[PDB]
Design a protein around this ligand. Structure first.
Ligand code: GNW
Ligand code: GNW
Lengths: 201, 194
């Protein structure tokens, strides 16, 4: 029965991927509140029953969209830091700040992660997502700066958690601004002062 | 008067709810228990508060008012001689007041969940921004912070300060978490203060 089981699993996975892809596209453009699951099923080319089979409700589909978008946010940030030509751990942290403002400025990321997710997931769910995706990259950037003597030896997690709070509030300030270009410049300038006050190099 | 009697009933309910939810959390104490603590009938309680969440919203207001009054008292008594020293005193005052067990449970743990993201952010901003922006404005005026628009720095610092408090709130060793987090916050602000 293994070909039959694997075939049904692969078909389920393809349906799931089409639904997430469709939902990510339409909610990214219009917002969660403005696109219903029937339109998303049509976009994905699946029936309502195929959708019900994969997702209990609209919010369950949104939770899976956030996972895929967060995975792409962190991969894009890692690509931009890798391509930055950062010569030291301190330069990699500055590159990571620039990458966060760039990727969180993507209109789809702004809409799904910064505007919809805190409301649709609620506080606990949104903070659990932010945490699962932010902590590893932040702790490793700190660890490498300590190892190079560019940051004081200290417990990594308390510093990581405070910086994640500062960086996520910076992104939210820009996302909710009516003049986001000015907000992004002003916020970039605050984070430059905060990071450059911390880093020894 | 009827208004004075209504106000006494309201005060008994807010006081009782603050006490019981302060100890056990919003999720773990129902309105029947609170009405018993307050010595108020359920009918008289539902007349004042549509539902559990409505009573909680009024508890958060009274607790937030006390948090900010206590912050102002501690900074006033700190002996801070300069705007930079007032900011340093306010960081210490926030870790002291957010360490109060009732503030920890009601503001750091329950309010974001019960009020929801948007509701909580509105209350947190309405209570945090005045004091934060005043402290920053005085430091900029004294030359001790870089010339810059106040609101962006205020919002990023409130994010750091609230995240520090919430990290301590759920720590396995809160005393240790507080010490290590106080060091981070003092170093973060010292890197920007002249
Ligand atoms: Cl140290 C550092 C500097 C810049 C960016 C990051 C990662 N972000 C943290 C906030 N949530 C998004 C990811 C870490
Ligand atoms: Cl500048 C400064 C320094 C420390 C404390 C505060 C006040 N707030 C208390 C509530 N949450 C945010 C911060 C401002």
């Amino acid at each position: 029965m293994e070909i039959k089981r694997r075939t049904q699993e692969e078909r389920s996975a393809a349906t799931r991927e089409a639904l997430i892809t469709g939902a990510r596209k339409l909610w990214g453009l219009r917002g969660y509140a403005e696109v219903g699951t029937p339109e998303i099923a049509t976009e994905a080319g699946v029936t309502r029953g195929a959708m019900y089979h994969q997702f209990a409700d609209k919010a369950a589909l949104f939770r899976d969209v956030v996972e895929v978008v967060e995975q792409d946010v962190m991969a894009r940030m890692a690509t931009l830091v890798a391509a930055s030509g950062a010569a030291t751990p301190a330069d990699a942290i500055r590159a990571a700040v620039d990458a966060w403002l760039e990727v969180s400025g993507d209109p789809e990321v702004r809409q799904l992660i910064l505007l919809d997710a805190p409301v649709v997931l609620g506080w606990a769910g949104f903070r659990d997502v932010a945490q699962r995706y932010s902590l590893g990259m932040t702790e490793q950037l700190i660890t490498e700066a300590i190892r190079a003597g560019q940051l004081a030896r200290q417990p990594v997690r308390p510093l990581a958690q405070v910086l994640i709070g500062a960086l996520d509030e910076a992104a939210m300030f820009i996302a909710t601004a009516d003049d986001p270009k000015r907000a992004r410049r002003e916020t970039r300038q605050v984070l430059r002062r905060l990071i450059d006050g911390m880093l020894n190099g």
